[PDB]
Design a binder for this molecule. Structure first.
Ligand SMILES: *[C@@H]1O[C@H](CO)[C@@H](O[C@@H]2O[C@H](CO)[C@@H](O)[C@H](O)[C@H]2NC(C)=O)[C@H](O)[C@H]1NC(C)=O
Ligand SMILES: *[C@@H]1O[C@H](CO)[C@@H](O[C@@H]2O[C@H](CO)[C@@H](O)[C@H](O)[C@H]2NC(C)=O)[C@H](O)[C@H]1NC(C)=O
Ligand SMILES: *[C@@H]1O[C@H](CO)[C@@H](O[C@@H]2O[C@H](CO)[C@@H](O)[C@H](O)[C@H]2NC(C)=O)[C@H](O)[C@H]1NC(C)=O
Ligand SMILES: *[C@@H]1O[C@H](CO)[C@@H](O[C@@H]2O[C@H](CO)[C@@H](O)[C@H](O)[C@H]2NC(C)=O)[C@H](O)[C@H]1NC(C)=O
Ligand SMILES: *[C@@H]1O[C@H](CO)[C@@H](O[C@@H]2O[C@H](CO)[C@@H](O)[C@H](O)[C@H]2NC(C)=O)[C@H](O)[C@H]1NC(C)=O
Ligand SMILES: *[C@@H]1O[C@H](CO)[C@@H](O[C@@H]2O[C@H](CO)[C@@H](O)[C@H](O)[C@H]2NC(C)=O)[C@H](O)[C@H]1NC(C)=O
Ligand SMILES: *[C@@H]1O[C@H](CO)[C@@H](O[C@@H]2O[C@H](CO)[C@@H](O)[C@H](O)[C@H]2NC(C)=O)[C@H](O)[C@H]1NC(C)=O
Ligand code: NAG
Ligand code: NAG
Ligand code: NAG
Ligand code: NAG
Ligand code: NAG
Ligand code: NAG
Ligand code: NAG
Lengths: 165, 219, 196, 146
């Protein structure tokens, strides 16, 4: 950083410090935050198992049975080169699942592949049909809450109510 | 030119291609309020905890939104049970889908036109999570829907996929709009040449017009 | 039912929170501090409690503009698809739609969509048109299929083949124009009846 | 107060985008996996088919539409007379080129000679407003006589 002679420090757009001039040695230093991320616990559900695997979000594995995803560093989950339907989602194409046992991590299967038997002169036609009853479920109504504001704030207190007004 | 006795009837047509652009998700932001509000201070944290569940529920709220951005991208693209694919030979009646079917030469599974669509759009407890489906897992579903469409019409929506010759699927199409299919066959070289010409104008309009994705750039 | 119980429990729990005050219990600001000091503490509990409700209410309003969009879509499905039959694809289950039966659930609607799905199937060779007397013939209510030795015409969504006739077909132009047209013979049921 | 504001802006934004996601899913269900008679819902013109394309955070449809592009003025009539009975098209519409009457499909000019196969009969020349006199050809009589 090409600092001016009179400038002692630099600030970021969040007004916290970006850089400083060292007062003992003539040099300009950056300051960077200590590395941080969310801790997320891939859980096979306590009724099935009590293993868990931990995703340290966004970090490179360096600052933390390990796997670097594009989502962060995943620990306690076993990478697999096959694909399956996404049992617990993670990110950037990865999901996890619990399999015969360990927690495994892999790229999720979008669906079974099917190249189509197309040509300029051939058709398929259904000879039989299947009447299927499919359920579809939709919300219609919330619960009809109403709040007595002044009993919430000031319940059993006129001396509160006189401020609330 | 209305009267009780005059009608106007089409003597000729253009097939036309139009572009319709929809947002489907926001960038999956998530926040730790504690690091935003009280960055590097347990004394500030001891004060902030007195405010109770405002700390938690901001993050539950952004979790509900972040998870929903993947529920959106599943319902929009993952409508098809199977990854359908075209044959290597392109006997589609003259209709040149090569600009909109996937290009296998490139690292991501997108078409020529989708690569313009990626060119025309762009620290403090704050974070951006990744999408659950990568841009190439989206490009695999747009290829599956498009390969099912070119080879099998509506039938892969209704149940199992049933192949049909493409220019005979277009006879089903023209009957769906009250034009009898002899109008397609008596003009098939013209219809394909108009369609190929139209797709070529989608390349040139998206290539020249840097602002074309304004509905996405503004999100 | 979970969110509309959880936002209530969250809003009850915010009664225990101190908000920077001496205590969250209202009698125990009053029975401890004199009114000049007690008002400066209670103004904290009022600013806290009030910001609690305004956030809870903003959530129930944003939530209501979500259950509303669900209920409009439940009304639109009951209109177009219980009270009718829908030609919209995938709008009333995966299938072609026959009908549906709406059922009640606590705070919701539960359709039973009844849909016709194409099951078992066979391949065929097929033709855009057929020749017979230089004139080109096209189907009327179906598509042309060869079983391997005989040409037929059938309805596009269920294999039920029939003899190709001028009752089952119509005509335009000639065989020079139609790409992929095949030579075949069309039966006319008038001819046995004009010979008789 | 600067967080509860931003989380509110995003909980609102999220319903504005979920509306566009539900609209994209509903376009894709109908406009792509089907054919849309729903007018203008799938681009100007009549709907043939549409092609989904990926884009950053979104979807682009290419809609293929049939558009009537050249047109001609014709004289028309709601019915024709022949036997004092009244004749209406089964499909399509009656048009006169100025010397001959024809029947043609509504969306593409392809004139045909008027017949008891192109038309059907109900009632008579008394009740129908605007009916005219013509010469219905019957394909059966040359073949009965020959
Ligand atoms: C369509 O498929 C159904 C089965 O899904 C066929 O019905 C079955 O026929 C076998 C004998 O061939 C019986 O043993 C089963 O009990 C039948 N099941 C039912 C529900 O009827 C049906 O015959 C097939 N239809 C056609 C036209 O091939
Ligand atoms: C319908 O319009 C198309 C143009 O949109 C006509 O096709 C063109 O015909 C001219 C000669 O008249 C040629 O110079 C062009 O190369 C043709 N264009 C294409 C894309 O093939 C077509 O002939 C018209 N049809 C009728 C019946 O009028
Ligand atoms: C489909 O359109 C593409 C152009 O987008 C055609 O590709 C060109 O083909 C010629 C040979 O005919 C080559 O010399 C060009 O270099 C190609 N250009 C590009 C951009 O690839 C293609 O031929 C067309 N396919 C069909 C079946 O008509
Ligand atoms: C194609 O369909 C026709 C009609 O069903 C089949 O021809 C008949 O075959 C039976 C024996 O299975 C004979 O008794 C009939 O006399 C035949 N009718 C005619 C008009 O020839 C034909 O076998 C089918 N083709 C194949 C490959 O199965
Ligand atoms: C359909 O049948 C006709 C005859 O009825 C075929 O016409 C022949 O075409 C070739 C190539 O032009 C000529 O060498 C022959 O002289 C024609 N025959 C007659 C009797 O004129 C026609 O090619 C057949 N089409 C198909 C697709 O099989
Ligand atoms: C209306 O259309 C008919 C043809 O469908 C035209 O009549 C034909 O005209 C040509 C050229 O003079 C003759 O070779 C044919 O013999 C005529 N056929 C009949 C049945 O008469 C008629 O000329 C057209 N009228 C106008 C004003 O365009
Ligand atoms: C169609 O032709 C008939 C005759 O076949 C026309 O009938 C005439 O109607 C007028 C008005 O009432 C009478 O004065 C004539 O005496 C009728 N003619 C006969 C032979 O009885 C009928 O008007 C014609 N319709 C049109 C629309 O021109
Ligand atoms: C296709 C065609 O010629 N249409 C004409 C139109 O151009 C003219 O303006 C109108 C009379 O006003 O009569 C009709
Ligand atoms: C899951 O829960 C049920 C009771 O609800 C229990 O019977 C079952 O044993 C549990 N699953 C496993 C894998 O133990
Ligand atoms: C993560 O650390 C490794 C060293 O083990 C390094 O090679 C890699 O580039 C780092 N990745 C990122 C994103 O910092
Ligand atoms: C996955 O496959 C690659 C070869 O394509 C191999 O190098 C890698 O070690 C494999 N990983 C596992 C866990 O099998
Ligand atoms: C149709 O033909 C393909 C080979 O081209 C074959 O894989 C498929 O099983 C056939 N299906 C039926 C139902 O005949
Ligand atoms: C169909 O494809 C075959 C194989 O390439 C070709 O020989 C034939 O001429 C084509 N026919 C039509 C009508 O496209
Ligand atoms: C159409 O309007 C004219 C007057 O402009 C009238 O003479 C004629 O009889 C009307 N015909 C019909 C079928 O309405």
């Amino acid at each position: 950083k090409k600092f001016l002679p009179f400038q002692q420090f630099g600030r970021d757009i969040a007004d916290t410090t970006d850089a400083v001039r060292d007062p003992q040695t003539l040099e300009i230093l950056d300051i960077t935050p200590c590395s941080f991320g969310g801790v997320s616990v891939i859980t096979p559900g306590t009724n099935t198992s009590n293993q868990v695997a931990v995703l340290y979000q966004d970090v490179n594995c360096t600052e933390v049975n390990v796997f670097q995803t594009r989502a962060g560093c995943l620990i306690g989950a076993e990478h697999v080169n096959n694909s399956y339907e996404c049992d617990i989602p993670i990110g950037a194409g990865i999901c996890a699942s619990y399999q015969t046992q360990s927690i495994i991590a892999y790229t999720m299967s979008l669906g079974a592949e099917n190249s189509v038997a197309y040509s300029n002169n051939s058709i398929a036609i259904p000879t039989n049909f299947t009447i299927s009853v499919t359920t579809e479920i939709l919300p219609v109504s919330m619960t009809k809450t109403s709040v007595d504001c002044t009993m919430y704030i000031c319940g059993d207190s006129t001396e509160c109510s006189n401020l609330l007004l | 030119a209305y009267s009780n006795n005059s009608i106007a009837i089409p003597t000729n047509f253009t097939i036309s291609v139009t572009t319709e652009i929809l947002p489907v998700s926001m960038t999956k932001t998530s926040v730790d309020c504690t690091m935003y509000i009280c960055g590097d201070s347990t004394e500030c944290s001891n004060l902030l905890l007195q405010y109770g569940s405002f700390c938690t529920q901001l993050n539950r709220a952004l979790t509900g939104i972040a998870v929903e951005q993947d529920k959106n991208t599943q319902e929009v693209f993952a409508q098809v049970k199977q990854i359908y694919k075209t044959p290597p030979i392109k006997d589609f009646g003259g209709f040149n889908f090569s600009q909109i079917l996937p290009d296998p030469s490139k690292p991501s599974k997108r078409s020529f036109i989708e690569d313009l669509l990626f060119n025309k759009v762009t620290f403090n407890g704050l974070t951006v999570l990744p999408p659950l489906l990568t841009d190439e897992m989206i490009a695999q579903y747009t290829s599956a829907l498009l390969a099912g469409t070119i080879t099998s019409g509506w039938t892969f929506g209704a149940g199992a996929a049933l192949q049909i010759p493409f220019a005979m699927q277009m006879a089903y199409r023209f009957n769906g709009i009250g034009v009898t299919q002899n109008v397609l066959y008596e003009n098939q070289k013209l219809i394909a040449n108009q369609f190929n010409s139209a797709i070529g104008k989608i390349q040139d309009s998206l290539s020249s017009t840097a602002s074309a994705l304004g509905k996405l750039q503004d999100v | 039912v979970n969110q509309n119980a959880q936002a209530l429990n969250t809003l009850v729990k915010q009664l225990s929170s101190n908000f920077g005050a001496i205590s969250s219990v209202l009698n125990d600001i009053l029975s401890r501090l004199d009114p000049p000091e007690a008002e400066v503490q209670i103004d904290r509990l009022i600013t806290g409690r009030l910001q609690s409700l305004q956030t809870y209410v903003t959530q129930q309003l944003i939530r209501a503009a979500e259950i509303r969009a669900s209920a409009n879509l439940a009304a639109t499905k009951m209109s177009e698809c219980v009270l009718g039959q829908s030609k919209r694809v995938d709008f009333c289950g995966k299938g072609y739609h026959l009908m549906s039966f709406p059922q009640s659930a606590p705070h919701g609607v539960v359709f039973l969509h009844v849909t016709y799905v194409p099951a078992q199937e066979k391949n065929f060779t097929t033709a855009p048109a057929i020749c017979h007397d230089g004139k080109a013939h096209f189907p009327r209510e179906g598509v042309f299929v060869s079983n391997g030795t005989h040409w037929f015409v059938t309805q596009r969504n269920f294999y039920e083949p029939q003899i190709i006739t001028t009752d089952n077909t119509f005509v335009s132009g000639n065989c020079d124009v139609v790409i992929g047209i095949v030579n075949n013979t069309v039966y006319d049921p008038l001819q046995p009846e004009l010979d008789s």
